Design a protein around this ligand. Structure first.
Ligand SMILES: [Mg+2]
Lengths: 586, 49, 1342
DNA sequence: GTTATCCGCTCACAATGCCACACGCGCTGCTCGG
DNA sequence: CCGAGCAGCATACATTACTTGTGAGCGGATAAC
C-alpha cells in the first residue's frame, strides 16, 4: 500500500524518497520497457537480456541482499528491501511489534530523596501535570470547573490554584511504574505511589535503587502510568515495591541496606571502653535516647539497660520477659524500632552489614511482611539519621602505613637481589628463578597486608580508670570496611598497604610489583602497569555487556512458552539431588 | 493505508526467497543442483523439458 | 624575573622538584604541521599537492601523442574571512590554480611537437584551509579532522596461533600491504604448502607467482635450497659434506672418509662427534647409492644423445631411476638439501601441488583467478599482471612503506623503489620459510613500530589524488575524442569531481566531525585525538579484545589513561603531551641523552623500535644535580619491560614526568594518588565541563593550565607587544612599540572580542578582556579570557568549599548535597545559546514571503515582531510564540482567470495564505539576543536586513576611521614640524586648527616642496582609505550562496541563563561524579565554629571503594590554599604596609622542600605586589605537577603556614540541631565541574500528541514530543510478573489501535478506566508487508 | 569403477538496550522549455 | 542557449579494504565390494 511507504516531504519540495518507491520504480520501469520490446518484433538476445535484468530487479526488490547490491544514487549504501523491513533490529518484529514505543509516559534523571516511605516515590510537578492530563480533564469536568474540554485545556495551560489540588486528588492512590534503562531482570520495573515534588528529578527509595542496580551517576529512569483500572490494581497488587522483596533467582532478600546506613547502624552499635556515660543503669530504651540527645552519655558506652523483648511461646501469643541486659546506649536506642518480635540477641552484636541482612531476614521470617517493611523503613531512617549525626569522614591521616612496610619491602628486595645474582651466577634456571621471585614477592605482599591490618584495626589503645586497653579500631577507614559498608580489606590493603603484584596484558605477572601504595606516590612505571590492568578490566566490561545481552535475548526466546498450567502432573521420575563435592570440601 | 496494488509482470520471474534460502525450496522440489538452477534462471543456460 | 606581564599578575605557587628541561611544545603541533606538509610547494615531490600531481601527471591521450602536465600551482587568498565565513555560513575555502601545459606531438613524426598550448592557472576547485587553530571552517560549522592510527604499509609476518584446524600446527602467514593498490600475502596450509593470495581470492599454491616472473623450475629450486652435490668418483659416490647437514637427525650408516671412521653406523649423531668431524675437515663422504631415496634432484639432466630427459628438474629420485640415468654420466648430481627442521622442504611440496608448468600458463592461471570468465590471451593476462604490480600508477609502496618493508628484511638501503620487485618477493618468501623454521620471529600488530598515524594533510591529499585520477580518465578520453590543437586547457577538465570529492571528504567524513567545542580542554583534546576507526581502519564490531589493550610501547607515545569508556575503548586515543609524529609518520617521543655517567640536557626523538633497542631510564630517578643517579640499581625499561640496571648501563632518560599522560590527564592534581580506573572517568568528565558566568581559577592546578589556555583558540592573545590604547567590553586596540612595526600600519592593531556566540554544543562562548587600560603588554600575552578561562588559566568549574560526611542520606549512593549559597552566588549558572533557522523557499505554486501580517492569529502573536515581521532583539519569548513571521502560497487549482484578474491586482498578495511561520519549539524559553538574515541576491531586501547591514557597515567603518585618525595625527605632526622649522609659524600651528594647514606656505624654494609631499600624501592616503572602505562595504552587502531554491534564511538566536537545580550532574576531577539532590537552605548546611557554612557536602563512602584518594589529598591542599588567601585577606582588610604583606607572601612562596621555581617577591613594584596580593585574596593558586606532586609533609607545612589544623579536619556543627558532629570531619576547597547532562535536557513526558505515519505509534525523541520506548527487556519484565492486563494495555491501547486509543481517551476523561482493545496497526502493517511479498498470510476465520 | 564416505571450501547469518544530539539525503547529461 | 526536469546510470571503474564466530550445504579426495 502507498501509505506504508510514504513519500515524506521537506520544508520545500525536497520529498525524501523512501527506498521502497525507488525499488518499485526500477522494477516497473524494467517491466514497461520489456513489454514495449516484446511488442516490437522482439530481437531475441535483446529480450533475453532484458528479462534477465527484470528478474534481477525483482530479486533486488524482494531482497537487496543476494546478487550484488542495488545502491541508490551517489549514496554508497544498499536500499531497504521488503525483507529489510522485517528482519533485524529495525525490522518490524524487534522494532515495532515486540517492543513498541509508548505515548503515555516520560523519563527523567533520578535523585535520592531519602525521606519517602518504601512504596512512595518522588515525582516532579511538571511530569505529573503532563502525564495525568486526561485524568485532570475528567476531574475538572466532574467538579464543573470547566464545562468544555478546551476550557479545561486552557485551565491546565494556566495552572490555576485549583488544578494542583485536583492533581493531588487524582493520584492519591493511583500507582505508577518506574523503569531503568537496561532492565536485566524482573525487578527492572517496579510500581510505586507518586508524591509531588519540585524540580525535575525523580526521587526513589534508596533500597529499591540498590535493587534496580541504579547508582546516582546521572542514570536516567523512565516513568509510566497504568491507566485502565485492571492495570492500576495490577500494579498495586503485583509489581508494587512492597511485594518484590526476594529475587526470583535466589530466595535471598533483594531489599538489602547497601551503604551509608550500615555505616550508621554500625557506628550506633559499638563500644568504646571508656565513653561518657559508661556504667549507668537505664530504665528503658527511651530513657537512653533522652540521655543521649541531651548530650550526657556517649552514643556507645557500656551500660545496664532494662528491656522488654517479646516472644511467641505458643503460635500466636506474645509473652514479655523484662530482662536487665548489659548493652550500650546505641543498641538500646536502636531497640526502639524492632516491632514486638525479634529477641534482643539480634541487636546486641556489633551489627555490621551481614548482621543487618540477617536481622531483616529473621524479621520477615517471624513477623510476616507488613511489620517487616515498616521495620526496614525505620531502619533506613534511623541509619541515615545517626550516620549524619556520626559525621563519618575519611581524611588523609586516616589510612595508616605500618612501620614495617618499609622494612619488609627492603628485606624482600635484598632477597630478590640475591636470587637474581644466584641466577646470573648460574645456580638456577631462569624460569624457576622467575617463579621464586614472584613467590617471595607474593609472600612479602601478604606480610605487608597482614601487618597493615593488624596495625590499623586495633591501633585504638585507650585506657579506662587506669592503664590501657585495646579495642577494635575507630578509624573512619576500616569502619567503612569492617562494617562491610563499602569496599573489602582487599581494597584497603591495595590502598594503604602495598599494591602488590600486577598483570601483563597477556595475563602473565610482572616480576617487580607495585611496591608503592595510593597514599604514597606512584612512579610512572607503576602507574603504567596499573593502567594495563584497569584497561583490561574496562574492555572486558564493554564487551561482556553486549555479549550477555545477546545471551539473555536468546534465552528468553527459547523458554518464553513455559507457563505452569497443570497443578500435579502425577509422575514419579525426578533427579537424585546430592550435595556437590568437587573433591575438596562440599 | 490498506489497499494494495499489483503489477502484471511482462514475463514470469523467480522469487528470490525460495531460490536462495538454504536449503533452496525449488532445488529440493526439483532434485536439481542449485548452481544449475541459478544458471538457468539468469538467462545463461537451457533446460530441456 | 622570567615571568611575563600576564604571569606577574598571579604567579601560581609551584610544588614539584624535578627541574623541567623541555617546555611543553605547541599542543596543536600535529594539525598545522600536517596541513603544512599538504599546502606548501614542496620542491622534492615527496608529499603534498606536488605528490598527487606528479603521481597522476603527466596525462596523455589514448597514446595519441598529446600530453598534459602541470608546471606549478598556487593558492589565491580566500575571498572571505574566518569570522565572516563562520557567521555567513560558508566554507573557509581557498582557490587552487595550476599551470597546465599541453603538448601535441603531431603525427606522423618522432618525439617532437609543433602544437603547444600553455594555459596557466586553471581553476580546479577550492580546498578548505586550516585556520591557525587547526580546525576547518566549513559552511556554517567548524569541523575538526582527527588523525587516524592504522597499520603502516609494508610487510609483516603473523603467526595465526593455532586458532584454525585445532592442531597446534600454527600456520605463519605473511602479508604485504601497499598504500594504493592490491595487497598480497602467503600462507602455510596445514599440509606445509605455501599458498599465494591476492587480497581475497581463491587460494593459490605460492610457487605459481614465481613462474609469473620469468622463473623456470631450475631457478626456482636454485633460489630456495642448498645444492648437495654427488660426484660419481671411481666408486661410492663421495658427496660433499658440511657437518651441520648430517648433524640434523637420525643417521643411517657409517660416514667414513679419508680412510678413517668418524661416525659409526648408528643413529642421531651426537654433537661431540659432529664437532670432531668439524675438526677433521672432511670434504667428501663415501655413501651407499641406496641411501638416496627422497632426495629430489634440482638440475634437469638429460641423456647425452636420446634427446629425452632421464632426470627432470624437481620430479623425484629413486634407485631404479638412478641406475637408469647413471648409464649416461654422471659427474655432478646436484640435489636439494632437505631437513624437517631447517632448510625445510616447503617449496618442493608446492611445486608438487603446482598445476601449471610454463610462464604463460602462470599468466593464464592468475588471469582466470583475478576475474573468472574471460578470454585469456597473452597480452590480456600479461598486462593484467603488469598492472597488478610493476606499475607506477596502479600501485605504489609509499616510500615510508618502502622503508618499513626494506628494513623488515634487514636490508641496508633505506631508500628504495615504490614498486614491488621479484627479488623482494622471493626475499619475503625466504623470510616466511625461515619463520616456519626456527630462525626469525613473528611480530605483533599492536606494537607501535607497525601502527603509524595519518594526519589531516596525508588523508586530504589521498582523497585529492582519488578525486584526481577520475578527472584524469575523463580528460584522457576527451583528449582522445576531442580535437588535438583547437582547445585551451580549461574545459576538458572539470572542477566538479575535484570539488565534489574534497568537499564530501571535509564535510561528510567518517573521521571529520563538528568540533567538540564546549570547553577549551575539550577543544584541544578533540584536536589532538588519535583514532583507529575510519576508512582503511578497523571498526568497533570486529575490533577484538586484543587491540584495545595498551601495548608497553604506548609509554610516552600515546596516553594510556584517557580514552572514551564504552563500545570503543582503546580505539580512540589521546596523543601524549610531548609526543610528536615522525618524518615517516611514526610516534617519536623525546628522551634525554645519557653519556657514560652524566645525564645531559640534550634530547633525541625516538620511535618505537629505536627505543626498543636502548635501555631507558626513568624521570623519577632522583639525580644529584650533576648527571649522577644517587642510587645504583635504578629502575629502567629496556625491551618492553621494567628492570633494574646500574648507573653505567642506562642510555636515555625520560624528559619529564608528564610525558606519560595526555594533556587531558595532565590537568588532574595528585593524579598519581588515583586508581587508573577512576582517572579515566576523571579525564572524561573534565572534557565535558561547561563554562559558567564568572569563570575562576582552580585553586589546585598542575601548571599545564597556562599552556593549554594559550595554545587553544578561546583566548585572544596579543600579537605584538606595546601599550593598551583603548579597551572596551567588545573591542581592544593596541599601539605597538616602535621596534615591532612596519613602514606603514602606524602600529595600532584591533582585536574584536567575539561576544556571546553559539557553539557546536549550544553553549555560550565569550572573550571578556582581562587586561586593564594603558597597561603595557608583551608579545604573546592573553588579552581576553575565553569561555571558562581566568587570566590565561584553564578554569572550568569552581573552587567549592566541600566537606566529606553523610548528611541524612541526601548523598546516599553518589549524590551531592549543596547549599543555597551556591545558587544565590550563581556559581554554576551557565548560559545556553541555540539557533533557529527559518527558510523562505520559492514554490512553483508561488514564492515565500516573510511579511509581518499573519492571516489568522490574534494581536498577541504579532506583538513581538517588528514592522517587517521579526521579533525585536530582547523579547523574552516562550515556547509557542512566533519568531517569524512567514506565510506561504497555500491554495492551488482554481483556474478561474476571471478571479485571477481580481486577485492579481486587488488581491495580489491575499490569495493563498498559510501560516507556516517559525515558532519557538514548545518547552524552550529564553531571550532573543541576535538575528542574522541571509538574503539571496536578486531577492531585493528587507528592512531589518538593511538595518543590520548598515550597523555592520558602521562597525567596519569605525576601525578604518580610527586608523585614519592615527595616520592623520602622525602626518600633521610631520606638517607642523615642517611648518615650524622656518617661516616661522610660532603661534599659528597651535591655535589654527586643521582647517588651513594643507594650503599655507613657508618659503617656497624647498619648503613648498615639503608641503607638496606632506599634503599630497595626505589625500592619497584619504583616497586609499576610501577605496578600502568601499571594498569592505561591498563585502558586507554582496550576494550570498543559497543554492537549492531558497530566498531568505532568517536565523534567530535564543539565550537562557540556565540555573542549577536538583537533578544536574556535577563531578570533581577524579571521576567522583554525582547528581545534585537538594538545594538545602543555608541555615541547615554544616558549619564551622567560625560561623562559615560549607557549600557542598559529598559522600565519604565513595572514596574507599573507587580507590581514588587523590581528591581528598587535593581537598586538603585546597583548604591550604584558601587558608593563605584568608590570611592575605586579613592583610588586605586593615591597610597593612606593603612591606609586611610582601614578606608574608614571600615566606609563602618558598615553603616547599626543594621547589623548581624561586620567585623573589623583590624586583616587584611596591604596587605590583598589591595587585598580585589582591589577585590572591581568594586563595593562593597552587601548582602540583602530575607525577611530582607535593608530599603530605609539604601540605602539612603549608597548612601550618595558615592557622589551620594539620589533620585537615575540623569540628563541624549540624545547622539543624546545633550540636557538633563527633569524629572531626574533613573539609576543604575542592574544584567542582558542571557537565552538560543538566536535567532540563532530559525531563519530559508525553500524554498524547503526534504519531508516526507509517506505523501508528508515538514518535521518538524529546524534540518530537514523543514518549518513552517500551523495549524487549521491558516487555519480558512486564510479563515476568503476571501483569497481563498491564502489558496488554501498554501494547495495544496506549500506542496503537487508533480507534481503541481515541476510545480510551474519551472514556477516561469520563471517569471510566476500562479499555476497548483491538489489533495494533503495526501488526496490520506487518501483514501488509508480508502480503506484499509473495507470501500469503491471513487471519484465521475462527 | 563405482558407490558410498569424509574433509576442507565457501557462503549465510547473528553482533545489548535506551537516550540524546548532530549531519546528510543523486544526478546529469539527455529532455522539456521558452 | 542555456535554464529546468528525467531515467535509469556500482559512475564504467577495479571500485576494492584481516581474520568475527558458527552452522550448514557442497565438491574433490577416499575406503570398500
Ligand atoms: Mg550509573
Amino acid at each position: 500500500p502507498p501509505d506504508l511507504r510514504p513519500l515524506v516531504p521537506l520544508d520545500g519540495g525536497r520529498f525524501a524518497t523512501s527506498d521502497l518507491n525507488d525499488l518499485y520504480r526500477r522494477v516497473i520501469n524494467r517491466n514497461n520497457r520489456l513489454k514495449r520490446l516484446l511488442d516490437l518484433a522482439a530481437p531475441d538476445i535483446i529480450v533475453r537480456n532484458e528479462k534477465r535484468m527484470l528478474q534481477e530487479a525483482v530479486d533486488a526488490l524482494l531482497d537487496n541482499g543476494r546478487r550484488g547490491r542495488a545502491i541508490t544514487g551517489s549514496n554508497k549504501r544498499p536500499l531497504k528491501s521488503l525483507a529489510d523491513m522485517i528482519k533485524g533490529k529495525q525490522g518490524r518484529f524487534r522494532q515495532n511489534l515486540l517492543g513498541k514505543r509508548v505515548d503515555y509516559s516520560g523519563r527523567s534523571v533520578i535523585t535520592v530523596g531519602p525521606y519517602l516511605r518504601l512504596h512512595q516515590c518522588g515525582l516532579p510537578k511538571k511530569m505529573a501535570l503532563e502525564l495525568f492530563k486526561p485524568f485532570i480533564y475528567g476531574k475538572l469536568e466532574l467538579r464543573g470547573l470547566a464545562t468544555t474540554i478546551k476550557a479545561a485545556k486552557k485551565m491546565v495551560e494556566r495552572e490555576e490554584a485549583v488544578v494542583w489540588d485536583i492533581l493531588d486528588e487524582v493520584i492519591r492512590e493511583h500507582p505508577v511504574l518506574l523503569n531503568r534503562a537496561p532492565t536485566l531482570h524482573r525487578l527492572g520495573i517496579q510500581a510505586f505511589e507518586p508524591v509531588l515534588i519540585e524540580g525535575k528529578a525523580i526521587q526513589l527509595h534508596p533500597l529499591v535503587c540498590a535493587a534496580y542496580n541504579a547508582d546516582f551517576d546521572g542514570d536516567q529512569m523512565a516513568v509510566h502510568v497504568p491507566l485502565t483500572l485492571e492495570a492500576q490494581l495490577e500494579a498495586r497488587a503485583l509489581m508494587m515495591s512492597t511485594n518484590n522483596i526476594l529475587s526470583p533467582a535466589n530466595g535471598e532478600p533483594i531489599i538489602v541496606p547497601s551503604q551509608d546506613v550500615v555505616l550508621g547502624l554500625y557506628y550506633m552499635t559499638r563500644d568504646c571502653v571508656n565513653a561518657k556515660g559508661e556504667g549507668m543503669v537505664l530504665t528503658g530504651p527511651k530513657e537512653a535516647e533522652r540521655l543521649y540527645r541531651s548530650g550526657l552519655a556517649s552514643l556507645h558506652a557500656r551500660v545496664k539497660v532494662r528491656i522488654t523483648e517479646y516472644e511467641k511461646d505458643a503460635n500466636g501469643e506474645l509473652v514479655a520477659k523484662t530482662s536487665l541486659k548489659d548493652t550500650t546506649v546505641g543498641r538500646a536506642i536502636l531497640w526502639m524500632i524492632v516491632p514486638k518480635g525479634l529477641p534482643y540477641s539480634i541487636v546486641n552484636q556489633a551489627l555490621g552489614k551481614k548482621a543487618i541482612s540477617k536481622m531483616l531476614n529473621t524479621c520477615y521470617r517471624i513477623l510476616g511482611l507488613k511489620p517487616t517493611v515498616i521495620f526496614a523503613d525505620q531502619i533506613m531512617y534511623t541509619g541515615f539519621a545517626y550516620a549524619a549525626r556520626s559525621g563519618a569522614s575519611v581524611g588523609i591521616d586516616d589510612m595508616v602505613i605500618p612501620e614495617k612496610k618499609h622494612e619488609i619491602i627492603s628485606e624482600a628486595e635484598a632477597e630478590v637481589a640475591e636470587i637474581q645474582e644466584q641466577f646470573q651466577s648460574g645456580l638456577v634456571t631462569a624460569g624457576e628463578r622467575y617463579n621464586k621471585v614472584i613467590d617471595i614477592w607474593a609472600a612479602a605482599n601478604d606480610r605487608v597486608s597482614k601487618a597493615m591490618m593488624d596495625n590499623l584495626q586495633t591501633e585504638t589503645v585507650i585506657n579506662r580508670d587506669g592503664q590501657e586497653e585495646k579495642q577494635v579500631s575507630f578509624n573512619s577507614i576500616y569502619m567503612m570496611a569492617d562494617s562491610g559498608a563499602r569496599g573489602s580489606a582487599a581494597q584497603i590493603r591495595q590502598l594503604a598497604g602495598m599494591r602488590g603484584l600486577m598483570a601483563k596484558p597477556d595475563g602473565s605477572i610482572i616480576e617487580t610489583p607495585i611496591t608503592a601504595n595510593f597514599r604514597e606516590g606512584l612512579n610512572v612505571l607503576q602507574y603504567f602497569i596499573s593502567t594495563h590492568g584497569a584497561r583490561k578490566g574496562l574492555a572486558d566490561t564493554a564487551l561482556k555487556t553486549a555479549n550477555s545481552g545477546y545471551l539473555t535475548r536468546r534465552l528468553v526466546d527459547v523458554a518464553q512458552d513455559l507457563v505452569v498450567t497443570e497443578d500435579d502432573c502425577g509422575t514419579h521420575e525426578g533427579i537424585m539431588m546430592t550435595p556437590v563435592i568437587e573433591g575438596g570440601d562440599v | 493505508r490498506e489497499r494494495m496494488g499489483h503489477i502484471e509482470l511482462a514475463s514470469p520471474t523467480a522469487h528470490i526467497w525460495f531460490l536462495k534460502s538454504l536449503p533452496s525450496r525449488i532445488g529440493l522440489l526439483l532434485d536439481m543442483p542449485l548452481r544449475d538452477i541459478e544458471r538457468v534462471l539468469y538467462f545463461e543456460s537451457y533446460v530441456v523439458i | 624575573m622570567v615571568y611575563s606581564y600576564t604571569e606577574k599578575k598571579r604567579i601560581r605557587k609551584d610544588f614539584g622538584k624535578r627541574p623541567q628541561v623541555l617546555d611543553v611544545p605547541y599542543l596543536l603541533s600535529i594539525q598545522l604541521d600536517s596541513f603544512q606538509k599538504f599546502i606548501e610547494q614542496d620542491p622534492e615531490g615527496q608529499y603534498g599537492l606536488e605528490a598527487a600531481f606528479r603521481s597522476v601527471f603527466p596525462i596523455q591521450s589514448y597514446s595519441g601523442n598529446s600530453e598534459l602536465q602541470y608546471v606549478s600551482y598556487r593558492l589565491g587568498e580566500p575571498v572571505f574571512d574566518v569570522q565572516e565565513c563562520q557567521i555567513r555560513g560558508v566554507t573557509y575555502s581557498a582557490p587552487l590554480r595550476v599551470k597546465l601545459r599541453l603538448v601535441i606531438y603531431e603525427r606522423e613524426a618522432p618525439e617532437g611537437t609543433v602544437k603547444d598550448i600553455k594555459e596557466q592557472e586553471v581553476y580546479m576547485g577550492e580546498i578548505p584551509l586550516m585556520t591557525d587553530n587547526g580546525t576547518f571552517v566549513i559552511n556554517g560549522t567548524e569541523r575538526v579532522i582527527v588523525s587516524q592510527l592504522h597499520r603502516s604499509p609494508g610487510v609483516f609476518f603473523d603467526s595465526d596461533k593455532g586458532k584454525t584446524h585445532s592442531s597446534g600446527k600454527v600456520l605463519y602467514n605473511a602479508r604485504i600491504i601497499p598504500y594504493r593498490g592490491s595487497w598480497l600475502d602467503f600462507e602455510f596450509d596445514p599440509k606445509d604448502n605455501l599458498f599465494v593470495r591476492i587480497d581475497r581470492r581463491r587460494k593459490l599454491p605460492a610457487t605459481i607467482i614465481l613462474r609469473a616472473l620469468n622463473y623456470t623450475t631450475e631457478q626456482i629450486l636454485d633460489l630456495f635450497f642448498e645444492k648437495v652435490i654427488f660426484e660419481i668418483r671411481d666408486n661410492k659416490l663421495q658427496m660433499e659434506l658440511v657437518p651441520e647437514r648430517l648433524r640434523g637427525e637420525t643417521a643411517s650408516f657409517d660416514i667414513e672418509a679419508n680412510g678413517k671412521v668418524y661416525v659409526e653406523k648408528g643413529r642421531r649423531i651426537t654433537a661431540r662427534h659432529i664437532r670432531q668431524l668439524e675438526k677433521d675437515d672432511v670434504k667428501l663422504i663415501e655413501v651407499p647409492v641406496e641411501y638416496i631415496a627422497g632426495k629430489v634432484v634440482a638440475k634437469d639432466y638429460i641423456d647425452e644423445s636420446t634427446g629425452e630427459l632421464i632426470c627432470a628438474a624437481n620430479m623425484e629420485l629413486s634407485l631404479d631411476l638412478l641406475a637408469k640415468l647413471s648409464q649416461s654420466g654422471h659427474k655432478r648430481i646436484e640435489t636439494l638439501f632437505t631437513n624437517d627442521l631447517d632448510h625445510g622442504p616447503y617449496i618442493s611440496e608446492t611445486l608438487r601441488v603446482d598445476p601449471t608448468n610454463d610462464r604463460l600458463s602462470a599468466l593464464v592461471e592468475i588471469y582466470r583467478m583475478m576475474r573468472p570468465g574471460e578470454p585469456p590471451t597473452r597480452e590480456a593476462a600479461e598486462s593484467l599482471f603488469e598492472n597488478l604490480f610493476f606499475s607506477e600508477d596502479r600501485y605504489d609502496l609509499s616510500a615510508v612503506g618502502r622503508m618499513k618493508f626494506n628494513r623488515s628484511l634487514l636490508r641496508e638501503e633505506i631508500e628504495g623503489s615504490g614498486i614491488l620487485s621479484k627479488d623482494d618477493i622471493i626475499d619475503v618468501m625466504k623470510k616466511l620459510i625461515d619463520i616456519r623454521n626456527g630462525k626469525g620471529e613473528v611480530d605483533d600488530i599492536d606494537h607501535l613500530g607497525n601502527r603509524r598515524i595519518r594526519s589531516v594533510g596525508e588523508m586530504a591529499e589521498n582523497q585529492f589524488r582519488v578525486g584526481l585520477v577520475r578527472v584524469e580518465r575523463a580528460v584522457k578520453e576527451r583528449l582522445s575524442l576531442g580535437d588535438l590543437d583547437t582547445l585551451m586547457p580549461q574545459d576538458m577538465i572539470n572542477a566538479k569531481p575535484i570539488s565534489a570529492a574534497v568537499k564530501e571528504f571535509f564535510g561528510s567524513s567518517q573521521l571529520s566531525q563538528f568540533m567538540d567545542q564546549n570547553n577549551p580542554l575539550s577543544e584541544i583534546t578533540h584536536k589532538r585525538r588519535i583514532s583507529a576507526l575510519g576508512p582503511g581502519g578497523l571498526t568497533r564490531e570486529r575490533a577484538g579484545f586484543e587491540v584495545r589493550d595498551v601495548h608497553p610501547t604506548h609509554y610516552g607515545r600515546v596516553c594510556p589513561i584517557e580514552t572514551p569508556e564504552g563500545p570503543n575503548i582503546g580505539l580512540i586515543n589521546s596523543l601524549s603531551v610531548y609526543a610528536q609524529t615522525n618524518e615517516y609518520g611514526f610516534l617519536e617521543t623525546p628522551y634525554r641523552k645519557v653519556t657514560d655517567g652524566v645525564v645531559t640536557d640534550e634530547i633525541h626523538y625516538l620511535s618505537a623500535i629505536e627505543e626498543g633497542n636502548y635501555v631507558i631510564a626513568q624521570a623519577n630517578s632522583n639525580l644529584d644535580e650533576e648527571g649522577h643517579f644517587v642510587e645504583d640499581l635504578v629502575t629502567c625499561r629496556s625491551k618492553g619491560e621494567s628492570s633494574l640496571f646500574s648507573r653505567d648501563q642506562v642510555d636515555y632518560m625520560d624528559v619529564s614526568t608528564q610525558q606519560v599522560v595526555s594533556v587531558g590527564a595532565s590537568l588532574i592534581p595528585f593524579l598519581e594518588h588515583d586508581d587508573a580506573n577512576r582517572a579515566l572517568m576523571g579525564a572524561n568528565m573534565q572534557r565535558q565541563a561547561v563554562p559558567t558566568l564568572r569563570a575562576d581559577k582552580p585553586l589546585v592546578g598542575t601548571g599545564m593550565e597556562r599552556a593549554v589556555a594559550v595554545d587553544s583558540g578561546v583566548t585572544a592573545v596579543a600579537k605584538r607587544g606595546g601599550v593598551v590604547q583603548y579597551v572596551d567590553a567588545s573591542r581592544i586596540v593596541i599601539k605597538v612599540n616602535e621596534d615591532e612595526m612596519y613602514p606603514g600600519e602606524a602600529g595600532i592593531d584591533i582585536y574584536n572580542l567575539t561576544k556571546y556566540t553559539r557553539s557546536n554544543q549550544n553553549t555560550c562562548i565569550n572573550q571578556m578582556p582581562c587586561v586593564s587600560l594603558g597597561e603595557p603588554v608583551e608579545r604573546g600575552d592573553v588579552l581576553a579570557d575565553g569561555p571558562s578561562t581566568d587570566l590565561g588559566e584553564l578554569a572550568l568549574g569552581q573552587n567549592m568549599r566541600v566537606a566529606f560526611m553523610p548528611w541524612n542520606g541526601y548523598n546516599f549512593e553518589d549524590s551531592i548535597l549543596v547549599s543555597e549559597r551556591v545558587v544565590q552566588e550563581d556559581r554554576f549558572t551557565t548560559i545556553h545559546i541555540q539557533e533557529l533557522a527559518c527558510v523562505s523557499r520559492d514554490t512553483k505554486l508561488g514564492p515565500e514571503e516573510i511579511t509581518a501580517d499573519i492571516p489568522n492569529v490574534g494581536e498577541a502573536a504579532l506583538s513581538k515582531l517588528d514592522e517587517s515581521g521579526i521579533v525585536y532583539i530582547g523579547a523574552e519569548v516562550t515556547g509557542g510564540d512566533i519568531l517569524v513571521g512567514k506565510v506561504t502560497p497555500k491554495g492551488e487549482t482554481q483556474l478561474t482567470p476571471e478571479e485571477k484578474l481580481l486577485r492579481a491586482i486587488f488581491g495580489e498578495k491575499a490569495s493563498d495564505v498559510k501560516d507556516s511561520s517559525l515558532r519557538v519549539p514548545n518547552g524552550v524559553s529564553g531571550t532573543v539576543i541576535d538575528v542574522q538574515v541571509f538574503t539571496r541576491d536578486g531577492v531585493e531586501k528587507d528592512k531589518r536586513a538593511l538595518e543590520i547591514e548598515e550597523m555592520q557597515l558602521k562597525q567596519a567603518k569605525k576601525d578604518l576611521s580610527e586608523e585614519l585618525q592615527i595616520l592623520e595625527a602622525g602626518l600633521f605632526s610631520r606638517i607642523r614640524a615642517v611648518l615650524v622649522a622656518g617661516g616661522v609659524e610660532a603661534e599659528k600651528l597651535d591655535k589654527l586648527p586643521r582647517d588651513r594647514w594643507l594650503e599655507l606656505g613657508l618659503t617656497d624654494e624647498e619648503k613648498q616642496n615639503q608641503l607638496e609631499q606632506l599634503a599630497e600624501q595626505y589625500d592619497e592616503l584619504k583616497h586609499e582609505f576610501e577605496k578600502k572602505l568601499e571594498a569592505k562595504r561591498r563585502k558586507i552587502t554582496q550576494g550570498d550562496d543559497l543554492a537549492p531554491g531558497v530566498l531568505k534564511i532568517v536565523k534567530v538566536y535564543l539565550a537562557v541563563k540556565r540555573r542549577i537545580q536538583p537533578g544536574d550532574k556535577m563531578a570533581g576531577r577524579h571521576g567522583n561524579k554525582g547528581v545534585i539532590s537538594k538545594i538545602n537552605p543555608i541555615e541547615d548546611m554544616p558549619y564551622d565554629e567560625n560561623g562559615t557554612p560549607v557549600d557542598i557536602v559529598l559522600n565519604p563512602l565513595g572514596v574507599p571503594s573507587r580507590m581514588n584518594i587523590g581528591q581528598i589529598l587535593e581537598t586538603h591542599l585546597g583548604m591550604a590554599a584558601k587558608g593563605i588567601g584568608d590570611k592575605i585577606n586579613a592583610m588586605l582588610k586593615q591597610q597593612q604596609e606593603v612591606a609586611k604583606l610582601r614578606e608574608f607572601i614571600q615566606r609563602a612562596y618558598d615553603l616547599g622542600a626543594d621547589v623548581r621555581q624561586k620567585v623573589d617577591l623583590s624586583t616587584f613594584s611596591d604596587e605590583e605586589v598589591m595587585r598580585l596580593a589582591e589577585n590572591l585574596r581568594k586563595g593562593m593558586p597552587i601548582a602540583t605537577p602530575v607525577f611530582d606532586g607535593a608530599k603530605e609533609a609539604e601540605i602539612k607545612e603549608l597548612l601550618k603556614l595558615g592557622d589551620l589544623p594539620t589533620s585537615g579536619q575540623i569540628r563541624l556543627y549540624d545547622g539543624r540541631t546545633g550540636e557538633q558532629f563527633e569524629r572531626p570531619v574533613t573539609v576543604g576547597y575542592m574544584y567542582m565541574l558542571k557537565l552538560n547532562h543538566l536535567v532540563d535536557d532530559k525531563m519530559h513526558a508525553r500524554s498524547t500528541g503526534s504519531y508516526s505515519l507509517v506505523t501508528q505509534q508515538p514518535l521518538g525523541g524529546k524534540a518530537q514530543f514523543g514518549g518513552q520506548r517500551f523495549g524487549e527487556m521491558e516487555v519480558w519484565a512486564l510479563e515476568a510478573y503476571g501483569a497481563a492486563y498491564t502489558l496488554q494495555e501498554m501494547l495495544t491501547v496506549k500506542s496503537d489501535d487508533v480507534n481503541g486509543r481515541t476510545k480510551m481517551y474519551k472514556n477516561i476523561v469520563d471517569g471510566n478506566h476500562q479499555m476497548e482493545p483491538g489489533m495494533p496497526e503495526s501488526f496490520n502493517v506487518l501483514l501488509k508487508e508480508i502480503r506484499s511479498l509473495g507470501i500469503n498470510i491471513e487471519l484465521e476465520d475462527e
